[PDB]
Every structure is written in structure tokens, then in C-alpha cells.
Design an enzyme around this catalytic site. Sequence first.
Site, PDB file in Angstrom:
ATOM      1  N   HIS B  72       0.832  -1.203   0.000  1.00  0.00           N
ATOM      2  CA  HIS B  72       0.000   0.000   0.000  1.00  0.00           C
ATOM      3  C   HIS B  72       0.866   1.252   0.000  1.00  0.00           C
ATOM      4  O   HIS B  72       1.822   1.386   0.780  1.00  0.00           O
ATOM      5  CB  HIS B  72      -0.956   0.015   1.198  1.00  0.00           C
ATOM      6  CG  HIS B  72      -2.059  -1.002   1.118  1.00  0.00           C
ATOM      7  ND1 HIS B  72      -3.334  -0.749   1.567  1.00  0.00           N
ATOM      8  CD2 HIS B  72      -2.079  -2.269   0.638  1.00  0.00           C
ATOM      9  CE1 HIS B  72      -4.093  -1.810   1.375  1.00  0.00           C
ATOM     10  NE2 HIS B  72      -3.355  -2.747   0.809  1.00  0.00           N
ATOM     11  N   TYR B 201      -9.761   5.162   7.272  1.00  0.00           N
ATOM     12  CA  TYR B 201     -10.005   5.398   8.691  1.00  0.00           C
ATOM     13  C   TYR B 201     -11.083   6.459   8.656  1.00  0.00           C
ATOM     14  O   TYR B 201     -10.961   7.420   7.902  1.00  0.00           O
ATOM     15  CB  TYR B 201      -8.773   6.011   9.333  1.00  0.00           C
ATOM     16  CG  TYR B 201      -7.682   5.019   9.594  1.00  0.00           C
ATOM     17  CD1 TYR B 201      -6.696   4.759   8.617  1.00  0.00           C
ATOM     18  CD2 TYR B 201      -7.624   4.334  10.810  1.00  0.00           C
ATOM     19  CE1 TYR B 201      -5.670   3.833   8.858  1.00  0.00           C
ATOM     20  CE2 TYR B 201      -6.602   3.392  11.059  1.00  0.00           C
ATOM     21  CZ  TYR B 201      -5.631   3.157  10.068  1.00  0.00           C
ATOM     22  OH  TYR B 201      -4.654   2.237  10.284  1.00  0.00           O
ATOM     23  N   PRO B 293      -4.880  -0.463  18.590  1.00  0.00           N
ATOM     24  CA  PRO B 293      -4.661  -0.770  17.175  1.00  0.00           C
ATOM     25  C   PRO B 293      -4.754   0.317  16.100  1.00  0.00           C
ATOM     26  O   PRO B 293      -4.262   0.110  15.008  1.00  0.00           O
ATOM     27  CB  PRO B 293      -5.576  -1.973  16.937  1.00  0.00           C
ATOM     28  CG  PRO B 293      -6.684  -1.781  17.921  1.00  0.00           C
ATOM     29  CD  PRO B 293      -5.999  -1.249  19.151  1.00  0.00           C
ATOM     30  N   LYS B 297       0.567  -0.642  15.106  1.00  0.00           N
ATOM     31  CA  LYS B 297       1.923  -0.799  15.606  1.00  0.00           C
ATOM     32  C   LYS B 297       2.242  -2.022  16.444  1.00  0.00           C
ATOM     33  O   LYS B 297       3.411  -2.291  16.691  1.00  0.00           O
ATOM     34  CB  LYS B 297       2.362   0.460  16.375  1.00  0.00           C
ATOM     35  CG  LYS B 297       2.324   1.750  15.546  1.00  0.00           C
ATOM     36  CD  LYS B 297       3.259   1.623  14.387  1.00  0.00           C
ATOM     37  CE  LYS B 297       3.203   2.802  13.507  1.00  0.00           C
ATOM     38  NZ  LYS B 297       3.720   2.444  12.152  1.00  0.00           N
ATOM     39  N   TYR B 385       3.515   6.527  10.133  1.00  0.00           N
ATOM     40  CA  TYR B 385       2.710   5.407   9.696  1.00  0.00           C
ATOM     41  C   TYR B 385       3.529   4.294   9.054  1.00  0.00           C
ATOM     42  O   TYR B 385       3.295   3.110   9.341  1.00  0.00           O
ATOM     43  CB  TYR B 385       1.556   5.873   8.777  1.00  0.00           C
ATOM     44  CG  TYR B 385       0.435   4.854   8.655  1.00  0.00           C
ATOM     45  CD1 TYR B 385      -0.618   4.830   9.572  1.00  0.00           C
ATOM     46  CD2 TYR B 385       0.455   3.869   7.666  1.00  0.00           C
ATOM     47  CE1 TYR B 385      -1.605   3.842   9.509  1.00  0.00           C
ATOM     48  CE2 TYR B 385      -0.542   2.887   7.610  1.00  0.00           C
ATOM     49  CZ  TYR B 385      -1.556   2.884   8.534  1.00  0.00           C
ATOM     50  OH  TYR B 385      -2.514   1.887   8.495  1.00  0.00           O
TER      51      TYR B 385
HETATM   52  C1  LIG Z   1      -6.654 -10.456  21.104  1.00  0.00           C
HETATM   53  C2  LIG Z   1      -5.810  -9.342  20.368  1.00  0.00           C
HETATM   54  C3  LIG Z   1      -6.280  -8.810  19.183  1.00  0.00           C
HETATM   55  C4  LIG Z   1      -5.517  -8.020  18.359  1.00  0.00           C
HETATM   56  N1  LIG Z   1      -6.150  -7.607  17.251  1.00  0.00           N
HETATM   57  C5  LIG Z   1      -5.343  -6.790  16.545  1.00  0.00           C
HETATM   58  C6  LIG Z   1      -5.892  -6.312  15.355  1.00  0.00           C
HETATM   59  O1  LIG Z   1      -7.042  -6.464  14.973  1.00  0.00           O
HETATM   60  N2  LIG Z   1      -5.057  -5.486  14.654  1.00  0.00           N
HETATM   61  C7  LIG Z   1      -3.790  -5.082  15.036  1.00  0.00           C
HETATM   62  O2  LIG Z   1      -3.153  -4.277  14.440  1.00  0.00           O
HETATM   63  N3  LIG Z   1      -3.279  -5.520  16.149  1.00  0.00           N
HETATM   64  C8  LIG Z   1      -4.052  -6.360  16.859  1.00  0.00           C
HETATM   65  N4  LIG Z   1      -3.457  -6.910  17.982  1.00  0.00           N
HETATM   66  C9  LIG Z   1      -2.017  -6.690  18.189  1.00  0.00           C
HETATM   67  C10 LIG Z   1      -0.995  -7.751  17.566  1.00  0.00           C
HETATM   68  O3  LIG Z   1      -1.662  -8.873  16.971  1.00  0.00           O
HETATM   69  C11 LIG Z   1      -0.005  -8.172  18.694  1.00  0.00           C
HETATM   70  O4  LIG Z   1       0.752  -7.064  19.184  1.00  0.00           O
HETATM   71  C12 LIG Z   1       0.929  -9.347  18.326  1.00  0.00           C
HETATM   72  O5  LIG Z   1       0.201 -10.600  18.284  1.00  0.00           O
HETATM   73  C13 LIG Z   1       2.131  -9.493  19.244  1.00  0.00           C
HETATM   74  O6  LIG Z   1       2.740 -10.796  19.145  1.00  0.00           O
HETATM   75  P1  LIG Z   1       3.401 -11.499  20.328  1.00  0.00           P
HETATM   76  O7  LIG Z   1       4.039 -12.713  19.706  1.00  0.00           O
HETATM   77  O8  LIG Z   1       4.222 -10.546  21.088  1.00  0.00           O
HETATM   78  O9  LIG Z   1       2.344 -12.066  21.261  1.00  0.00           O
HETATM   79  P2  LIG Z   1       1.044 -13.020  20.905  1.00  0.00           P
HETATM   80  O10 LIG Z   1       0.810 -13.025  19.447  1.00  0.00           O
HETATM   81  O11 LIG Z   1      -0.074 -12.690  21.829  1.00  0.00           O
HETATM   82  O12 LIG Z   1       1.621 -14.471  21.215  1.00  0.00           O
HETATM   83  C14 LIG Z   1       2.173 -14.828  22.482  1.00  0.00           C
HETATM   84  C15 LIG Z   1       2.003 -16.309  22.545  1.00  0.00           C
HETATM   85  O13 LIG Z   1       2.489 -16.669  23.798  1.00  0.00           O
HETATM   86  C16 LIG Z   1       1.624 -17.706  24.322  1.00  0.00           C
HETATM   87  N5  LIG Z   1       1.612 -17.828  25.788  1.00  0.00           N
HETATM   88  C17 LIG Z   1       0.879 -17.121  26.732  1.00  0.00           C
HETATM   89  N6  LIG Z   1       1.099 -17.572  27.965  1.00  0.00           N
HETATM   90  C18 LIG Z   1       1.999 -18.598  27.847  1.00  0.00           C
HETATM   91  C19 LIG Z   1       2.623 -19.356  28.834  1.00  0.00           C
HETATM   92  N7  LIG Z   1       2.272 -19.206  30.125  1.00  0.00           N
HETATM   93  N8  LIG Z   1       3.561 -20.228  28.406  1.00  0.00           N
HETATM   94  C20 LIG Z   1       3.817 -20.314  27.085  1.00  0.00           C
HETATM   95  N9  LIG Z   1       3.259 -19.634  26.048  1.00  0.00           N
HETATM   96  C21 LIG Z   1       2.347 -18.784  26.536  1.00  0.00           C
HETATM   97  C22 LIG Z   1       0.256 -17.451  23.737  1.00  0.00           C
HETATM   98  O14 LIG Z   1      -0.574 -18.628  23.706  1.00  0.00           O
HETATM   99  C23 LIG Z   1       0.594 -16.888  22.372  1.00  0.00           C
HETATM  100  O15 LIG Z   1       0.774 -17.971  21.472  1.00  0.00           O
HETATM  101  C24 LIG Z   1      -4.203  -7.756  18.775  1.00  0.00           C
HETATM  102  C25 LIG Z   1      -3.687  -8.291  19.992  1.00  0.00           C
HETATM  103  C26 LIG Z   1      -4.491  -9.077  20.792  1.00  0.00           C
HETATM  104  C27 LIG Z   1      -4.014  -9.740  22.114  1.00  0.00           C
END
Ligand SMILES: Cc1cc2nc3c(=O)[nH]c(=O)nc-3n(C[C@H](O)[C@H](O)[C@H](O)COP(=O)(O)OP(=O)(O)OC[C@H]3O[C@@H](n4cnc5c(N)ncnc54)[C@H](O)[C@@H]3O)c2cc1C
EC number: 1.14.13.2
Lengths: 394, 394
Positions: B72, B201, B293, B297, B385
Amino acid sequence: MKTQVAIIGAGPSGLLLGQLLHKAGIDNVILERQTPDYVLGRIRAGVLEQGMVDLLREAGVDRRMARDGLVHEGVEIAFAGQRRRIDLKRLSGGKTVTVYGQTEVTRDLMEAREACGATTVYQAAEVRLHDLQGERPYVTFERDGERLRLDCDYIAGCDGFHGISRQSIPAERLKVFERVYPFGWLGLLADTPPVSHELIYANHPRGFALCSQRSATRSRYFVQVPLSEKVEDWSDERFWTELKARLPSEVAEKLVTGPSLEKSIAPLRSFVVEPMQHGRLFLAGDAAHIVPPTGAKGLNLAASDVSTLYRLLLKAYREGRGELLERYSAICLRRIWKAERFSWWMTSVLHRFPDTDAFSQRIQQTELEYYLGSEAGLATIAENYVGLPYEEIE
Amino acid sequence: MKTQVAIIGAGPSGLLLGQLLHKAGIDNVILERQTPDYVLGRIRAGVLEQGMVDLLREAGVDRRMARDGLVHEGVEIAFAGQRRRIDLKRLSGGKTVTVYGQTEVTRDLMEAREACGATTVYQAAEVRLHDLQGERPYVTFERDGERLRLDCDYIAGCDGFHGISRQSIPAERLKVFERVYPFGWLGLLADTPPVSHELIYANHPRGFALCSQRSATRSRYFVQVPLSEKVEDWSDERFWTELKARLPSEVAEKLVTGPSLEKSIAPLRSFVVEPMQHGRLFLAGDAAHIVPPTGAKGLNLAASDVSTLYRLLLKAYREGRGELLERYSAICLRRIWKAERFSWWMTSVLHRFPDTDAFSQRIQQTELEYYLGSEAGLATIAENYVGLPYEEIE
Ligand SMILES: Cc1cc2nc3c(=O)[nH]c(=O)nc-3n(C[C@H](O)[C@H](O)[C@H](O)COP(=O)(O)OP(=O)(O)OC[C@H]3O[C@@H](n4cnc5c(N)ncnc54)[C@H](O)[C@@H]3O)c2cc1C
Ligand SMILES: Cc1cc2nc3c(=O)[nH]c(=O)nc-3n(C[C@H](O)[C@H](O)[C@H](O)COP(=O)(O)OP(=O)(O)OC[C@H]3O[C@@H](n4cnc5c(N)ncnc54)[C@H](O)[C@@H]3O)c2cc1C
């Protein structure tokens, strides 16, 4: 008496509109509640936009300003030890601001009006406005006990925030937008040389501080102070110590202090009314709006309202196009709201707000770091600081 | 078992750090509480910064993204009838963003890890972290009833906001910064072609709305909704009608609707902890911070934390410079706070906040008018952005 344009208020707004209008051949009478000395005692503003500078030139009241006014090419914002310079000239495409005191502008204008023989009635008591929607509005006032009447075509309310002109509009025709800040500025005028050749805005844990000037041997300093503070609780010495405690060491060390010529506390406010007119009555300057002083936009918005009301009236008289005056509030409000937004932002990032949580403090600090370190961030402050372009119309 | 780096969490953070580290020769074991299917069911993010794109390329997991991801060049912000386009490419000096779903990124990474034979333990129950300040920290977990121990040099907490890693740091060593917004987003995934080739948006009197996509035949739409809303109160049809009521007519008219593949409500939050490390434990992604969101970021900050933790560990192992790892939180926090500020601003200007006075509403409207009509204003949004540059270090 009779005139074409009746102007209520002999502060900067009324006098500028008055001078411009006179030079163009549109007679005008100014009515002022106080005496000339009273008006000249007000210290007020010190920073003029290029736009207001050009307007003083057009009224032909710029000889002393060109001589004694100082052209500033940048300002400095200090936060967390750092001192960042915003090169206004570079980042704005060559525009700068001019430091010339409001008291001096008011003086220059008053002298000019006397020399040209235009009418100004001082000590005009109990001014009342009548028949605002008629074809023949009029003003009544008391001069040494007797009530007199001045007939005019139009009335320009240039009477400040506490003026009679805004209160003369039926309350239901107006929409008010207001935000009162929980602090004011404690200002001090000193006959001492300034600590910098440019202004310094400072965000300090203890509260905002500003290092300004009027000339090479006259300074003006401000500190943010709680709304409960009384000026008699601030001795010259208490002030100097507080100003120093809020500035970076290398600056506080160069500071030449001295007794105050003037000391006063002014609360901060944002205020806008829509529309800015009613029938034959047009509000300009503080009568229609207030901005906190952080962005130095007060006297500058008054100038743009005036430049606008003038050009519209010029058309109305010299060209018979009186229908254009309906466009006053719309034109004016566009510039007003942007300056309100700029003043509000400036106030938000430079001041210490009470009962603020940890997140907001970090956001405030990060706002400054971002805006003062990004070329696009600096350009947004710069273009807003020097002043956004005046609108044209037709 | 023994490994060099133990990674808790198999979401995007853990898998990316895992892949990068493996390709460089640093063994790592990932522990994940859920099953692979559970992880792959999460819809989440869709917008990737150039920086994260380059990181997927470095992990060698970009074949399908280059194929199916959409580049985009701009976004559109609609307010008060107007639709303003921010040319991201032009205003950022040539940078763009890529639309490729988080579920797909997670898939690509999981496939890559399988093919290379790296270790991943799913259904790792009750993970506990031990001896974080020792020279030999360790993790215990339950696998089909029995407790096992994994010895490692370092532990990367990539376990999200509800993970065990942040709770393992003694509360007194951490400073939390949090702001909870009084609304959430109601999102809907539909197998229908998107209403625009770019995101939209929308700030509408009724509340925020966002028109996004995943590909040419898959759309994602969001509406701001009160914190009390339950998803079962939102039928596909109620949603479509509300989305349409918040978009400009020419857009709502082109909208192809259809049954939802997924519907869910996500509350908005800002969260940052300082520092992001404790002894041999380093937090990355959602474990250390949350952004609303609006600025897309989340997944992008996770990527930068990871790119940073990786390069530091690379130095620690391949070059023996393990002292550099102390610089992790400082490096990471600089980028984090700026993105937090950008997300916060975005949220502030695009959303309808409850119990808002007339002044603030006008300021919000004026913020948009200014930023979307000034070349410097547009550049501040644009550069933020597409993503501010990743820090270097040495
Ligand atoms: C529910 C939700 C919805 C979102 N929706 C959007 C969206 O629509 N658009 C957008 O821009 N951003 C969105 N975000 C933001 C973006 O998706 C996240 O910032 C991103 O997933 C970060 O990745 P991460 O790997 O740090 O953590 P996560 O993707 O949350 O993954 C962490 C992992 O660690 C695991 N875990 C948790 N506890 C334990 C444990 N005790 N032992 C072992 N493993 C464990 C979990 O099961 C998960 O698999 C969303 C975030 C959340 C939580
Ligand atoms: C007390 C105060 C302090 C300020 N300090 C600063 C500062 O430090 N720095 C800065 O940047 N900005 C400051 N400002 C802002 C700036 O000086 C003003 O915006 C500017 O003076 C506007 O000019 P004006 O002519 O519209 O109104 P004013 O200058 O207020 O003048 C209006 C005039 O109308 C007169 N008047 C009132 N009622 C009547 C009546 N009933 N009939 C007739 N005449 C009447 C008044 O006596 C006054 O002469 C200050 C404003 C105020 C009120």
C-alpha cells in the site's frame, strides 16, 4: 454625532482598524471606557507575526517599529536538560517574527490617530449598542454626566473579553467554546538585558518558564503558577529564585536579575464564540476569542480579524459590495481555530498539569522529543509559530 | 533438556526470534501453552512496516508474502464528508507498508521452523521461570502430566500481555505506564472484495470506523463500540448497517457485504513497562507493551524488539560481547514510546470519546483539518505510519 464606522475600544484592535479605515477615507469614531494613560499602562504582548508587521506598515505606523523592533529568526525550547532550537526562518520558508511591545504598538497608533485628527472619545461611560439589525444602528454613551448618541452604519466591537459588544448579542444566537486551564502565568518586567537573543520556553518538573524580552535592556520573564497564587506573595527575589530553578544551569548562570518594573498574574484561557457578528455589529480580537499566551497568538489574531473586517468594509464602501460582510465570521473562524489548536498544543506540551498520571507525563515528554527531533515535526511548530497565511476572498 | 535460548510463546514474536536465531546457529527451544491450531485461529493484525518486511526476508520466510502480500502506497482518512489521502510513499521519502495477515505470517514461520527441525513444545503447561539473575536460569513446564526442566543461557519472554514472563519479574523492579480507553473495536472478517484498494479510517459523529483488507477477496472492517457491548448483540446485519452509517455515501454505496467468517470485540489499551529485562530474561512484543490498534503498531513493535534482541544475542554469542545485552531496554524503549505516542494521537483524533465538551470536539476536528492539509502535517503522520527507522548500536 454621526460616523460611518463606530469602533468600541481603543486597545490595539480598535486603533488598528481605526487607522486603516481612516487612511482609506472611511470615517470612524472610537469610544473608550478608560483614559489614554490607563490604556498605555498595560504591558501585555511582545511577539508580532510577519502579517501583523505588514498591517502596521499599511496603516503607515511602522517607523518606530522598524527602528526598535527586533526580528527573531528562531526560538528555543528547553526540556530534560536539552535546549532545542527551532530555526523559524529555515523551516518556514523564510518567515520570521518581530519583537516589539504591544504598549509601544498602542502608543504608535494613538500618536498617529491624533496627528490625523480622527475622533476618539475617552472616558466614554456606559456604552450601549442599539438597533443592531436595523439599517441605522446607534451607540449611546455618557460623557461627563450627559448621555449622547452616535449614529453609524456599522459597529466594530473591539472592546476586549469584558467588553459590552459581545454581551449585546442575544445569547441564543451564539455558541461558546471554552476551556479554563488550572494555572496562570506570573510575569515580571525588568530593566535588565535579556538572557538570550531569542526566546526560551522551558518545560521543567517544577512548572513552565519563559524567557522573553522587549529590547536589548528590557526583559520579560514568566513562571507557571497555581491558580491560588496572589502576586503579593511573590517578591522579586522569590521570583528570580524560581525562574532560575526552572532553567538549565548554563542559562540560569548568565541571568542578570534586578527589581521589577511590573509584576502581575494572568490566568490562561481558550475561548471562541461562533458567529463573530450579529446584524451591523462585528467582533474583533479579544471580544470574540481568547487563547492562552503560550503561542503568542492573542494580538496576532486581533490583527487578522482587523485585516479581514477592514478589507470587507473597504469593499462595502468603495465598491458597494456590502453583501461580502456576511463572510466575516467564516473567514475569521478558519484562522482562529487553527491558532487555538496551536496554542492549546503548545500549552499542553510545555506546562505541568496537576493530577497527571505516569502515562500522560511520558506522552508529554515524547511529544517534545518527537516534534523537536523530526524535520517534519519542527516544520509544524515553525509554520504555526510565524503564522499561517491570511485568507484572501472575493 | 538444554538449549542456548529458551523462548516462551509461539506467536509472531517467539517464532520470528526463533527463526532468526536458528539460521544464525543459536539453538533455541520454544514453549507454547496452546496447540498450533489454536494459535493459527487468531485473526489479528494485517499491516506490516517495511522494517518487518525486511526482517521476514532475513529469516528467509518471505516467499508467500512477496507473492500474496499487497504493497500500500497510501491510506485515506475520512472526516466531515471529506476523504483525504496521505500519499505515504511521496511524504515518507519512498517507504510503503505491506498488507499480509498476521495469521499468514505465523503460518509461514511455523512451516519454516518445522522444515528446519528446530524444537517447539506445544501444550507446555504451567511454565515457570527460575534463577533469572544466576548464570544458569531454567524453565520448568508440564508435558502430559510430568514436570520437565529446560536449562538455557537466556530466556526471551514472547508470551503476550497475559504471559508468565512479565509476572516473573519482581514487581518492584518495574514501572508500569497504562491508559485504558473507554471503548473497543468490534471487528468483522468477510470473504468479500474490499471497498477500496487502500485502508480508510473514518471519524464519524457516531464513532470510529475502519475499512481494511487481507487480499482481493477478503475484507476486515471495524467499528468503535462502547465497553459494555457483547458480540452476540451484533448480528452481521446490524454491523453492516452501522458500518454504512459511518462511511461517506459514495463509499457505503460500493460496499459489498456478506456473512462474517469471524466477529470479535477487542478493547483498546496503552501499556509500557520499564525496563523490559531482568537478569537473563528479556521481554519482547506484547509481553512488554500494548498499543491501541489505530496505528497498526502492535505486531510492528514486536518485530523491532525481536530484531533488536536478536542482533544483541548475535553479538553475545558470535563475538563474545555479552555486555551489550544491557542496552536492550534502552534501545527498545526509544522506538516504543514514539510508536505509543503515534498510536495515542491517532486514537485521540479518530475516535468519539464520551462526555466530551464543545471545545475539545472542535479541537479534534481542527487537528484533522490542520494535519491533513499541511504538507508538514501530512509528513508527520506519513513517516510515523510507515515506521520510524530502527536504531543501530555498537
Ligand atoms: C486479542 C488481540 C487482538 C488483536 N487484534 C489486533 C488487530 O485487529 N489489529 C492489530 O493491528 N493488532 C491487533 N493486535 C495486536 C498484535 O496482533 C499483537 O501485538 C501481536 O500478536 C504481538 O505478538 P506477540 O508474539 O508478542 O504475542 P502473541 O501473538 O499474543 O503471542 C504470544 C504467545 O504466547 C503464548 N503464551 C501465553 N502464555 C503462555 C505461557 N504461560 N507459556 C507459554 N506460552 C504462553 C500465547 O498462547 C501466544 O501464542 C491484537 C492483539 C491481541 C491480544
Ligand atoms: C490582562 C491580559 C494580559 C495579557 N498578557 C498577555 C501577555 O503577556 N502576552 C501575550 O502574548 N498576550 C497577552 N494578552 C493577549 C493580548 O494582549 C490581547 O489579545 C490583545 O490586547 C487584544 O487586543 P484587543 O484590542 O482586542 O483588546 P484589548 O487590548 O483588551 O482592548 C480593548 C479595549 O476596549 C476597552 N473597553 C472595554 N470595555 C469597554 C466599554 N464598555 N466601552 C468602551 N471601551 C471598552 C478596554 O478598556 C480596552 O482599552 C493579554 C490579554 C489580557 C486581557
